[PDB]
Design a protein around this ligand. Sequence first.
Ligand SMILES: CCOc1ccc(-c2nc3ccc(-c4nc5ccc(N6CCN(C)CC6)cc5[nH]4)cc3[nH]2)cc1
Ligand SMILES: Nc1ncnc2c1ncn2[C@@H]1O[C@H](COP(=O)(O)OP(=O)(O)OP(=O)(O)O)[C@@H](O)[C@H]1O
Ligand SMILES: Nc1ncnc2c1ncn2[C@@H]1O[C@H](COP(=O)(O)OP(=O)(O)OP(=O)(O)O)[C@@H](O)[C@H]1O
Ligand SMILES: [Mg+2]
Lengths: 571, 664
Amino acid sequence: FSVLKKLGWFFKAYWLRYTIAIVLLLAVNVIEMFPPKLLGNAIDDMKAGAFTAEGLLFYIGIFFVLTAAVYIMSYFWMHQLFGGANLMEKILRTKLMGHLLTMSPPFYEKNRTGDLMARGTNDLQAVSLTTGFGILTLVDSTMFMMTIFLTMGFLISWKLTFAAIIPLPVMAIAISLYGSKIHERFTEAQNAFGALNDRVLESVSGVRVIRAYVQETNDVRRFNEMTADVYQKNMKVAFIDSLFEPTVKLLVGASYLIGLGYGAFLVFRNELTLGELVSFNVYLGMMIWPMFAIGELINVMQRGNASLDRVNETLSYETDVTDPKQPADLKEPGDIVFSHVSFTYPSSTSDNLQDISFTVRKGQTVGIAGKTGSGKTTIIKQLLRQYPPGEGSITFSGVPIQQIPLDRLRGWIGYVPQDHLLFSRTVKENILYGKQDATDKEVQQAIAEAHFEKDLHMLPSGLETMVGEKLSGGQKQRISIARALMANPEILILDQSLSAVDAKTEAAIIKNIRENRKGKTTFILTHRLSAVEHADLILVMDGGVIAERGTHQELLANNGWYREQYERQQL
Amino acid sequence: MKIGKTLWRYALLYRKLLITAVLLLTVAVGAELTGPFIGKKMIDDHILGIEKTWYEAAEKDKNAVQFHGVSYVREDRLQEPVSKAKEAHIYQVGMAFYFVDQAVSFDGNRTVSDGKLTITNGDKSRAYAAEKLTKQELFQFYQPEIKGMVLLIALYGGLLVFSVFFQYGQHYLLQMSANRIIQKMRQDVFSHIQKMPIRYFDNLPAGKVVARITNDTEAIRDLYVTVLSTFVTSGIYMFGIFTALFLLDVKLAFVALAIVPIIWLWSVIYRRYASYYNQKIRSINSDINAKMNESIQGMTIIQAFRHQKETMREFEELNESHFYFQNRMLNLNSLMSHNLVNVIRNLAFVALIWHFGGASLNAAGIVSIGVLYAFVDYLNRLFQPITGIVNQFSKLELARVSAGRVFELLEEKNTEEAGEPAKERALGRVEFRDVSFAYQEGEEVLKHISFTAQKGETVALVGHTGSGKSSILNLLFRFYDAQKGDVLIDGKSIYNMSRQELRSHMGIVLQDPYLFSGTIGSNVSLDDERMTEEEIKNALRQVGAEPLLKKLPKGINEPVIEKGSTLSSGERQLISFARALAFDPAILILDQATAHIDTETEAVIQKALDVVKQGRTTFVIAHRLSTIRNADQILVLDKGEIVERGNHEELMALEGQYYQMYEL
Ligand SMILES: CCOc1ccc(-c2nc3ccc(-c4nc5ccc(N6CCN(C)CC6)cc5[nH]4)cc3[nH]2)cc1
Ligand SMILES: Nc1ncnc2c1ncn2[C@@H]1O[C@H](COP(=O)(O)OP(=O)(O)OP(=O)(O)O)[C@@H](O)[C@H]1O
Ligand SMILES: Nc1ncnc2c1ncn2[C@@H]1O[C@H](COP(=O)(O)OP(=O)(O)OP(=O)(O)O)[C@@H](O)[C@H]1O
Ligand SMILES: [Mg+2]
């Protein structure tokens, strides 16, 4: 079982608990093998003339003692084992989320959200089940089975044991084959049921179309046809599922019958006694559970193995895309200066930014405009360390962006992405997200600066209500702006953050932000060119390259690109 | 109502299959539990037969054994012949068998000193000369019993195979009953869905409707399988085993019956704790999944703000809680389940030893080792299903709530009773009489809307967002009832014609064209089964370029399985238009409030409209107030009330809202 070898760290880390569990399990096997032989001995000593009240009392006391010992030691060893499984689950979950938190957007481009959830919700289950239940089934199948076999062979007979054991291997093989076929047919039935769910989704999503064309009878006809198909698949499943109990009953009754009849014959030959015969049956009655276990063992191990690989496939082999390097002693950002940068995305065959070189000084404000798809946001993607370095050089003061540690860089920047993004928590928590719950008095200032106060007083207090799991594009943009502003960032990046609010509102927001932040940089990106009017630098992006570097007046006097000229083009 | 009553009612259908399966199960249970009874008769009568008295008999006698020079025959086999005195015996002392060619009064502690057998029962009964039966001689006292043993073994095997056949039959038929009940229930629920108001669908997410239709029905299937296969099976099995026990012994059978309360109490307590632990595990696991999801989608903000430490801390809080409750569940499953099963089994062994040892010490010759063996086997059979029983008992609640959901869906009273299409054409005319529409209550969305449209097509209805245009669309199709005024199509009130009759006239084209998975032709035809090869109606819409582009949309290509995402939005709209033309309605309605333009696709869309509006009364709720330039009659909606009523030129000649919008 390669799963256990691959899982060596857990066992080496937790060795005492597993040694305790294994030792107690062998001991429990030994002390559970006794009561059957004791019952047989009571029967035998009964038939012989030697039997008194002292022997009866001895048997009763010893049975109570062994019952208590088995119960207590079982509680302890399997508490240990299954707690080890639970601990493995917890360790894998914490490890998985920790690995996720260190990953960059490229990892999520390569890994779908469902697949990550699939791993973290099924492969962890499989690996923990291996850890505990697969260990239990392995040790049972291997040691418990041989222990019962040997106890039969030595303390009863080797002639009855080999004879009355033939059925059980056959039973185990048949059970494994039935498990395989039932799993296959169950997958088929699940496919059919999923098809039914898909259809029932279309006919509830497209209710109006169906009803507007009086097709609410052919819809029922199709639904009935696929319900019949699902029934047929479930029937194919049940056909092979009904072979388990008949086969177990047949092949266990055959073993019981062989034991009983051949032991009667052996008694006739004086090679065996009545009590022994009873004991033998009890042993068989406790050798059936191992048989099932065998199959289960194989199953879980295989799953474990596969599952673990997938976990390890997207838990270790994916290294960080960005990392700090040799922290440079730069306390505050200076003047951002791109030097012929270029940035092709991992999933792009084009440069996506060609020899882009522009400079920003402290307290300066930058405006980026251009056609859709003109790397407007891509530029600031080069300033958040979300992707490989690119080319050229971004140097705050003189030090290249790589040298600055990621933590310090991300402490400088205040980022407001164009895509509205808020978490399931309260609005106040989203605002505190900038400082991570440091103080609350500045929340009012942040709300006022973004002009969200008017939009904050039209919902119930409710801890500033909740977002995500429980309300407007403009409101969302304003709360994101307040969150970014709460950081008091030295560099504030707004990316089409006011496309939802009106021109008056966005102009007021830009004015207030610029006034409050005088000595700190501010990138503004917007299709609406009226929000970058006051910026002292504007450069329009067209594909990979810039086209219209200059001030608002310079660009007005250079070329007519949107501006006020096309503002009334649609009006 | 009650979910139990409803489940029993739905089972009463297929009651015949249930009865068949139950009778097969009873046959199997009897032909199974009889196996251990053969062993009791293969031991007490055959093996322990030598323990019974022997009498002298002649050699010619059948089933007579020659020990030294005298033939002896067992008392039970003695029958009428050779019924006399001078009995013999074969007693057991230690591991040896001793012949007593003499009558013995009592039985008790047997000791052999030297060719003597002293039996003591608290009064030192007597001593008798004893001989040893060696091995061959003792075996000769057993040879007569070989043939009956063979017969009993053959009976065991035959009854085994017979019971096995019937076990397969009963399980298969129980599964068949469950699946057929579930299929019928699904059909009933979906049919009831087709007769539900559009209000229900509007005020409830689709994923919840699909859930209640399908996933809760699968839960009901699991509940039926549980009940039939576990509860009924094990109840009948225990009934049979207790019958067998009372057949064997009554007092020990009562001791065995003293565990029904054990099972009941085990189930009660295990459920009491496991429901709590499992609910906590489920809620915390759902929380963990939600946290991992929101962090995966949003990590750029988890990292851009250095919130990684805090999000990890919260996830670890949830992880610790989940681990703690999992360990509590482990402690429960250790104090109960297989451990308590084994403890009860050993208590059973103790009870057997106590009872039979005491009976022996009474020295009444009532050992009956066969009874003990059969009891051991019956108790081992009895203990097998307890763990499954308790697991199912704990898990019943989820199925209970799912059944409640599905039955609440089934038992809705407010439904639409219709299904009568229109047998004649509409001719395309419609009128409104101050229809006062309020969605929920009080808050009116269309106040005194009164207008009339004639066979002339292209009647545009424009206005600002949230004005009442889609409410008008809903009223036209009777998705909702205006609860005031009236709407007349061709002079007939829509409230006095079957909803199917009404909708048989009017086609619909919406902002989001619903492209049901299937072929393009099946998408245009909606698998109506009456549409012939009339997909040229698409060619009327001028789709022609695309069928050349694609393999064969005319009922032979299936590019819609992906919801049409691969296809362009213009192509989706054109397919919806083709469907509208193919169904050849009379009162067409166009809800195209989509603010987007979908560059240049509008072009073909316009062409498409130009080929459909002819010979209908085309309502158009398209935006941009430019597609409606030539519309026969514009109508501006605001405040749920028609304020300006006139043509394009007339409205542009009076300024107002229409002029204001036109400039924008
Ligand atoms: C005879 C005297 O002694 C007896 C010996 C055994 C049994 C016995 N009765 C049984 C009833 C059911 C099962 C059983 N329950 C199962 C649940 C699930 C599965 N699966 C699911 C499908 N695939 C994956 C395979 C495993 C198998 C299962 N097999 C086992 C059983 N064993 C009864 C008496
Ligand atoms: N995740 C990505 N993977 C690959 N290429 C991408 C990715 N995101 C963007 N691109 C490329 O970048 C081009 C535009 O980049 P970006 O979206 O950053 O700027 P923009 O569209 O001009 O502005 P904005 O994002 O403000 O709308 C897209 O056309 C695409 O070529
Ligand atoms: N199912 C409903 N229940 C209650 N109110 C609704 C419902 N559907 C829509 N409304 C509201 O009723 C009013 C009527 O708007 P309507 O649905 O007719 O849309 P519309 O004005 O045509 O919008 P659009 O700008 O998309 O064209 C709006 O406030 C709308 O939000
Ligand atoms: Mg609308």
